[PDB]
Write a protein that holds these residues in place. Sequence first.
Motif, PDB file in Angstrom:
ATOM      1  N   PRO A   1       0.951  -1.017   0.374  1.00 47.13           N
ATOM      2  CA  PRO A   1      -0.008   0.133   0.016  1.00 47.13           C
ATOM      3  C   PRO A   1       0.847   1.161   0.187  1.00 47.13           C
ATOM      4  O   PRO A   1       1.692   1.268   0.739  1.00 47.13           O
ATOM      5  N   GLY A   2       0.822   2.089  -0.867  1.00 44.44           N
ATOM      6  CA  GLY A   2       1.505   3.224  -0.965  1.00 44.44           C
ATOM      7  C   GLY A   2       0.961   4.026  -2.282  1.00 44.44           C
ATOM      8  O   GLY A   2       0.443   3.712  -2.999  1.00 44.44           O
ATOM      9  N   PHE A   3       1.952   5.123  -2.352  1.00 39.80           N
ATOM     10  CA  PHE A   3       1.500   5.983  -3.608  1.00 39.80           C
ATOM     11  C   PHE A   3       2.243   5.586  -5.053  1.00 39.80           C
ATOM     12  O   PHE A   3       3.591   5.018  -4.766  1.00 39.80           O
ATOM     13  N   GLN A   4       2.136   6.011  -6.174  1.00 39.49           N
ATOM     14  CA  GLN A   4       2.906   5.874  -7.191  1.00 39.49           C
ATOM     15  C   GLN A   4       2.914   7.186  -8.131  1.00 39.49           C
ATOM     16  O   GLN A   4       1.927   7.561  -8.581  1.00 39.49           O
ATOM     17  N   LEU A   5       4.131   7.264  -8.710  1.00 36.89           N
ATOM     18  CA  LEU A   5       4.340   8.359  -9.691  1.00 36.89           C
ATOM     19  C   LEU A   5       3.861   7.950 -11.092  1.00 36.89           C
ATOM     20  O   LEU A   5       4.255   6.738 -11.448  1.00 36.89           O
ATOM     21  N   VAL A   6       3.602   9.037 -11.872  1.00 40.93           N
ATOM     22  CA  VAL A   6       3.222   8.788 -13.159  1.00 40.93           C
ATOM     23  C   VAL A   6       4.073   9.998 -13.936  1.00 40.93           C
ATOM     24  O   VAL A   6       3.640  11.019 -13.550  1.00 40.93           O
ATOM     25  N   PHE A   7       4.830   9.930 -14.862  1.00 36.91           N
ATOM     26  CA  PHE A   7       5.139  11.135 -15.326  1.00 36.91           C
ATOM     27  C   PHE A   7       4.291  11.630 -16.458  1.00 36.91           C
ATOM     28  O   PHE A   7       3.253  11.141 -16.851  1.00 36.91           O
ATOM     29  N   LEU A   8       4.654  13.034 -16.833  1.00 37.05           N
ATOM     30  CA  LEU A   8       3.600  13.592 -17.779  1.00 37.05           C
ATOM     31  C   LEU A   8       4.469  14.376 -18.901  1.00 37.05           C
ATOM     32  O   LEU A   8       5.266  15.323 -18.402  1.00 37.05           O
ATOM     33  N   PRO A   9       4.162  14.367 -20.101  1.00 35.87           N
ATOM     34  CA  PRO A   9       4.962  14.984 -21.109  1.00 35.87           C
ATOM     35  C   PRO A   9       4.813  16.676 -21.128  1.00 35.87           C
ATOM     36  O   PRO A   9       3.909  17.080 -20.442  1.00 35.87           O
ATOM     37  N   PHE A  10       5.614  17.395 -21.668  1.00 34.93           N
ATOM     38  CA  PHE A  10       5.742  18.811 -21.795  1.00 34.93           C
ATOM     39  C   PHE A  10       5.283  19.527 -23.098  1.00 34.93           C
ATOM     40  O   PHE A  10       4.058  19.672 -23.310  1.00 34.93           O
ATOM     41  N   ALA A  11       6.105  19.526 -24.238  1.00 38.77           N
ATOM     42  CA  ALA A  11       5.929  20.066 -25.382  1.00 38.77           C
ATOM     43  C   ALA A  11       6.265  19.575 -26.728  1.00 38.77           C
ATOM     44  O   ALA A  11       5.560  19.550 -27.812  1.00 38.77           O
ATOM     45  N   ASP A  12       7.676  19.060 -26.702  1.00 37.82           N
ATOM     46  CA  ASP A  12       8.076  18.644 -27.945  1.00 37.82           C
ATOM     47  C   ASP A  12       8.324  17.010 -27.833  1.00 37.82           C
ATOM     48  O   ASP A  12       8.828  16.353 -28.583  1.00 37.82           O
ATOM     49  N   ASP A  13       7.580  16.589 -26.606  1.00 37.93           N
ATOM     50  CA  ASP A  13       7.543  15.178 -26.567  1.00 37.93           C
ATOM     51  C   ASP A  13       6.604  14.623 -27.463  1.00 37.93           C
ATOM     52  O   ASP A  13       6.678  13.840 -28.564  1.00 37.93           O
ATOM     53  N   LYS A  14       5.401  15.377 -27.714  1.00 36.21           N
ATOM     54  CA  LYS A  14       4.195  14.719 -28.761  1.00 36.21           C
ATOM     55  C   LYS A  14       4.607  15.562 -30.035  1.00 36.21           C
ATOM     56  O   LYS A  14       4.565  16.712 -30.304  1.00 36.21           O
ATOM     57  N   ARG A  15       4.969  14.628 -31.208  1.00 37.50           N
ATOM     58  CA  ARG A  15       5.189  15.175 -32.388  1.00 37.50           C
ATOM     59  C   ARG A  15       3.741  15.067 -33.189  1.00 37.50           C
ATOM     60  O   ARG A  15       2.863  14.982 -32.788  1.00 37.50           O
ATOM     61  N   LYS A  16       3.999  15.325 -34.397  1.00 35.45           N
ATOM     62  CA  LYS A  16       2.702  15.301 -35.379  1.00 35.45           C
ATOM     63  C   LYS A  16       2.984  14.322 -36.417  1.00 35.45           C
ATOM     64  O   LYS A  16       4.235  14.334 -37.043  1.00 35.45           O
ATOM     65  N   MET A  17       1.959  13.462 -36.644  1.00 38.98           N
ATOM     66  CA  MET A  17       2.009  12.646 -37.368  1.00 38.98           C
ATOM     67  C   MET A  17       1.826  13.048 -38.942  1.00 38.98           C
ATOM     68  O   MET A  17       1.345  14.439 -39.014  1.00 38.98           O
ATOM     69  N   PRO A  18       1.725  12.415 -40.023  1.00 38.47           N
ATOM     70  CA  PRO A  18       0.803  12.842 -41.311  1.00 38.47           C
ATOM     71  C   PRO A  18      -0.675  12.844 -41.065  1.00 38.47           C
ATOM     72  O   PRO A  18      -1.018  13.793 -41.154  1.00 38.47           O
ATOM     73  N   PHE A  19      -1.088  11.862 -40.448  1.00 31.51           N
ATOM     74  CA  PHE A  19      -2.564  11.522 -39.523  1.00 31.51           C
ATOM     75  C   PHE A  19      -3.945  12.094 -40.699  1.00 31.51           C
ATOM     76  O   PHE A  19      -4.979  11.781 -39.965  1.00 31.51           O
ATOM     77  N   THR A  20      -3.945  12.740 -41.587  1.00 33.63           N
ATOM     78  CA  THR A  20      -4.891  12.929 -42.424  1.00 33.63           C
ATOM     79  C   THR A  20      -5.412  11.800 -43.280  1.00 33.63           C
ATOM     80  O   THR A  20      -5.242  12.017 -44.516  1.00 33.63           O
ATOM     81  N   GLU A  21      -5.651  10.746 -42.617  1.00 34.44           N
ATOM     82  CA  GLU A  21      -6.427   9.518 -43.414  1.00 34.44           C
ATOM     83  C   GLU A  21      -7.366   8.903 -42.440  1.00 34.44           C
ATOM     84  O   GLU A  21      -7.026   8.541 -41.276  1.00 34.44           O
ATOM     85  N   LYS A  22      -8.674   8.677 -43.185  1.00 35.30           N
ATOM     86  CA  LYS A  22      -9.617   8.201 -42.434  1.00 35.30           C
ATOM     87  C   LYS A  22     -10.234   7.460 -43.447  1.00 35.30           C
ATOM     88  O   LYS A  22     -11.338   7.943 -44.326  1.00 35.30           O
ATOM     89  N   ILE A  23     -10.459   5.967 -43.586  1.00 35.72           N
ATOM     90  CA  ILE A  23     -11.170   5.186 -44.593  1.00 35.72           C
ATOM     91  C   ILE A  23     -11.835   4.118 -43.546  1.00 35.72           C
ATOM     92  O   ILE A  23     -11.427   3.725 -42.535  1.00 35.72           O
ATOM     93  N   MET A  24     -13.235   4.066 -44.017  1.00 37.51           N
ATOM     94  CA  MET A  24     -14.156   2.853 -43.120  1.00 37.51           C
ATOM     95  C   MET A  24     -13.955   1.713 -44.135  1.00 37.51           C
ATOM     96  O   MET A  24     -13.929   1.435 -45.266  1.00 37.51           O
ATOM     97  N   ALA A  25     -14.129   0.745 -43.375  1.00 42.86           N
ATOM     98  CA  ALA A  25     -14.006  -0.842 -43.737  1.00 42.86           C
ATOM     99  C   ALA A  25     -15.743  -1.224 -43.651  1.00 42.86           C
ATOM    100  O   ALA A  25     -16.606  -0.563 -43.339  1.00 42.86           O
ATOM    101  N   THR A  26     -15.893  -2.676 -43.960  1.00 43.06           N
ATOM    102  CA  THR A  26     -17.102  -3.296 -43.811  1.00 43.06           C
ATOM    103  C   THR A  26     -17.174  -4.315 -42.784  1.00 43.06           C
ATOM    104  O   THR A  26     -16.235  -4.854 -42.446  1.00 43.06           O
ATOM    105  N   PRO A  27     -18.379  -4.397 -42.115  1.00 38.19           N
ATOM    106  CA  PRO A  27     -18.566  -5.337 -41.018  1.00 38.19           C
ATOM    107  C   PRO A  27     -18.852  -6.714 -41.396  1.00 38.19           C
ATOM    108  O   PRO A  27     -19.812  -7.245 -40.891  1.00 38.19           O
TER     109      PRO A  27
END
Lengths: 147, 244, 490
Positions: free
Chosen positions: C386-412
Motif C-alpha cells: 500500500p502506497g503511492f505511485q508516480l506517473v510522469f507527464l510530457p511537456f511540449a516537443d514530446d508529442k510530435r505530429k503524424m501525417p495523420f490525415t487519413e480516415k477510411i471505413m471498412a465493412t462489417p
Amino acid sequence: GVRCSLLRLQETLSAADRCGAALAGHQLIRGLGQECVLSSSPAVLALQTSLVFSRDFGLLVFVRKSLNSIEFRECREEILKFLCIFLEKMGQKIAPYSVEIKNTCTSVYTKDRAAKCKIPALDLLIKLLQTFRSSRLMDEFKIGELF
Amino acid sequence: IHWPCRLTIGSNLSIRIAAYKSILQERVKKTWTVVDAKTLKKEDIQKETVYCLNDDDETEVLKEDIIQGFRYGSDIVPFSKVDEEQMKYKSEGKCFSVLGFCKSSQVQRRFFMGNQVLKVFAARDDEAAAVALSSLIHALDDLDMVAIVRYAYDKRANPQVGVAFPHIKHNYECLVYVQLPFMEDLRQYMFSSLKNSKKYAPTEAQLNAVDALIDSMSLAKKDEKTDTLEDLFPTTKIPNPRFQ
Amino acid sequence: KYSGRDSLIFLVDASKAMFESQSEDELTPFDMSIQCIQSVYISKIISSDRDLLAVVFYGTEKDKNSVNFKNIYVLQELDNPGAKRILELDQFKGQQGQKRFQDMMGHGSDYSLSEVLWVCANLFSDVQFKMSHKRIMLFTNEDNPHGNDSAKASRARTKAGDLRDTGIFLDLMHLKKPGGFDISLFYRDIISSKLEDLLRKVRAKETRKRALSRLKLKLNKDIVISVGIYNLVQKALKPPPIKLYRETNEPVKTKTRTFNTSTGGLLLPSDTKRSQIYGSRQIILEKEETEELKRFDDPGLMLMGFKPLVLLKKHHYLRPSLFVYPEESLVIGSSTLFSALLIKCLEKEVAALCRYTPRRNIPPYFVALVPQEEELDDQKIQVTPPGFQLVFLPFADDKRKMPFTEKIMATPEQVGKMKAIVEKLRFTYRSDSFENPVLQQHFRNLEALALDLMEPEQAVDLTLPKVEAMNKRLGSLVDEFKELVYPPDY
DNA sequence: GCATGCTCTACTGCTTCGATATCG
DNA sequence: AAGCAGTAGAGCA
DNA sequence: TGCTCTACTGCTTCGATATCG
DNA sequence: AAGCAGTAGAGCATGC
C-alpha cells in the motif's frame, strides 16, 4: 625483543591462511611500537637506529613484499604511522637513512589505493623535508622527479 | 520519417504497415565544445589516455595488448570480442509479429516500462491492408481484448515484447505500441500494511481536514450546463522551460 | 540486515545403496545429487554471487574434520561460489566418477549420528559475519538410518533440537528410492521429492534492494512529509567489460590527460573554458556557468493542486514509474498523515499533482501521484504493497505530429471471424517467465569459457512465435479472412 | 589562578555500488 | 561508434 | 532526355564514459 | 543510500 619480533614478522609474511597473518601483523607492529619506546638509555637507541634498517630482513622489505595485496592495510599503515613519530622520538640519527625512506613512501603512496594509507605516508615525507632544511641531501632527494 | 514494416498473424496475414513515433523524451542537440582560454580557437587541445599498467613503478604500454576480460564468480575470465561477435545472439531480422492475445485486460498501468511510444497506423497505397487493420481494431474495440506484439527495429536491437493498445478516435483509427518487462526486470519486496495497522490510524476530524484541503484544492469540476468536465491547470500544454 | 549474507551446507549421504544402482538401470542417485549441486552452484554464481556454499560428504571411509572424528569428510569451506569449486567437484559424475570417488575417498562405512550435525555447527560458528539464513540441504534416501539402536536416535534428535535452538534449519531434498512419495514415515522430529527449483527455474536473475532517493513533499510551505522513492522495475543489463593486460593477465588501470596547446606542455582544469558556436558568433563560458544555467529549485516534491483519475489517458507516459512510501526520518506521524491522505485520495478517487525536483540541481518535473491499496489473501498472496505511485507527464516537443490525415471505413463482414480468431488464440496472460534471449545466451556463453565443456549450451528463447502450431490451431479460415471482401489480385 | 590531565558523543568524512545523465 | 533508406552526380544509352 | 550504379546525408539505432546519491 | 570509523572538542577531577 627486537629482531626476534622482526623474524616473527618475516614468518608472519611467509606463512599460510592470510587472516591470522593479518592479526599477527597488526599485533606485532603495535607491540613493537611499545617495546621500542620503553628506552631511555643511549645504548639501545644507538642500536635501534641501525636495527630497524637492514636489507635481508627489514621494515622497508616487509612493506614492499606485502604491497601487491588488497589484504594488509591495518598493519603496513601502522608501520607508516609509526615512522612519522620515529622521526620525532629520535632526532637526526636518521641522516643518511632517509633517501630510501623517501622512495619507500613514494612507492607506498603511488601503488596502494586507500586514502587512510596515503594520509600518514604523506604526513611523513612532509615531516622529513621539514626537519631536513639543513645543507645537504636536497640534491640527493630527486626533486626534479618528485616535483 | 515514414516507417514501412509488415504485420503477421499465423501463417499469412501479411499486412503492409506504416509506423511513426509519438511522445518521447526530448533532448537538446547542441554540445559544449571545450576550448582553451586566451586564444579563442579550438585546435589547442589534443587529449590523450595511456592504458598504464603500473601496479609498481610506472610502465606505460601501447594499445595492442588489451583483452576485454569479464568477471565470473570470484575471478576474471578472458576472451574479448571476435569470439563474442561470433557466439552472440543471432537476431535473424526485424519483426512486428503477434505472439498471442488475452481477452482479460491484465496489462495494467504500472508495468509499461519503455522510453517511447509507437503509433502503428495503417497501410498506404491501395489500402486493402489498412481496411483489414481497421477491421482488426474494430474487432478489438468491443471487449477489453489485448494484443501481445513482438518488435525489433533491426538486426542490432534486442527483440522485445510489448502491448498494442487500440485507439478509436475521430479522424484516425490507430494502434499504439508500448514496451513490457522481461523477467529479469522485476523485483517484488514485502512492505508493511497500512489498513490493519494498530498504531497509525487517523481521526475523522483529520480526515475531514484532508477532504476540505482536497475540495478547496481541487482543479477539475463539471460546469457549462452539460456537466462535462472542465479542468484547471492542465499540465500537458506547458512549453519546456529548460531549453527556454 | 542490508549487508546480510546467507548460507548453505550440502550434506551428502553416499553410504550403502545410494552408491549402488539400486539394481536399477534407469537412474543413479549419486550422479543425480551431484547434478543438482552443480545446478545450484552454476545458477547462484551469477544470480546471488555473495552467499556461502559448502559441500560435505558423510559416511565415507576416511575422515577430514577439525574436531577429528571418523567417517566424516568435509571437502570445501564456507565461501563464494567458485569456478575452481565446480571444476573440482564435477569429477564425481557417472560411473567413472563413482570409481574415482571410490579410489579418492572410498564408499561405505557405519556412518555417523549427532556428530555430523556437530561438524555443521562448528562449520557455521567460525564465520565472523552476519549469517541471515542457516539451511542444510540433505541428500539422502534411507528413512530409518539408525533403526536398530535407539540411543543414537535419541541423541540425534537431541542434537538436532540444539541445532534448531541456535537457528539452524534443514530441508532434506528427498532422493527417489521408491520413485513416488510412498515413504510416509515418522521423520517429523527433525524437519521444520520435488527438485524442479533446484533443476531449472532460475538461470538469469539477481537480488538487490535500495531506495534511490529520500525526498520530502511540502504541501503549503510548512507542512512537510518524508517519502522514500523506491524503484520497482529497473531494466537489468549485462555487466561492464573489465579491461585486461595480455601477458600478465591483470587490469590495465588507465589514466588520462590533456595538452598540446600549440606548445605541448600539460594542462589543468582552470586554463580551459566551455564554448558553443551558433552560426557565426561564438560563446565562451565557465564550467560553473554551464552548470548553473540549469538551476531552478531545491530537492523535493511540491504540491500543486488535485485531480481525479479521469483526465489522464494511458496514451500518455514518458518513463518508468517509481513508487513513493512513507519513511521515518521526519516525525512519528508522517505515516499517519500519509495513511489519512491515502484513504481520502482512494475513496474520492482523487490523485495528487506535484512538481518534483530529484536531486540538488535538476530542472523540475511534473508528476502525478496515484494511490494503490494492497492485496493479500489467505495464503499471503502479497501482490501489492500500500502506497503511492508516480506517473510522469510530457511537456511540449514530446508529442510530435503524424501525417495523420487519413480516415477510411471498412465493412462489417470481418468482426465475427476476428472474434472467433481471438477467442481461438486466447491464453491467460502470465505471472513470470518471459526471459531475455540476449542476456540469457550471454550467461550461457560465459559458462562455456571458464567451464569450457563443449560449445555454447542450450539457448531456447521463449519469445518466438510458433507458426507451425499456429496454422493447425487456427485452421483453414486464413484464406477466407484474406479474400472474403478484398482481393489483392496483383 | 588558570595550567594540566582525562572522557564520552555528534560532525566529518570513507567506501562500495546502484542509478542516471551524457558522450560517441 | 555503426548501419540506413531517401536524394541526387553522373556513367550508360 | 531516359535508366541505373553509386556517392552522400541527414537520421536514426545502439555502446561506453564520468557524475552522483 | 548504506554502513563504518575516527576524532575534535566541550565537559569531569586534581596541580606550580
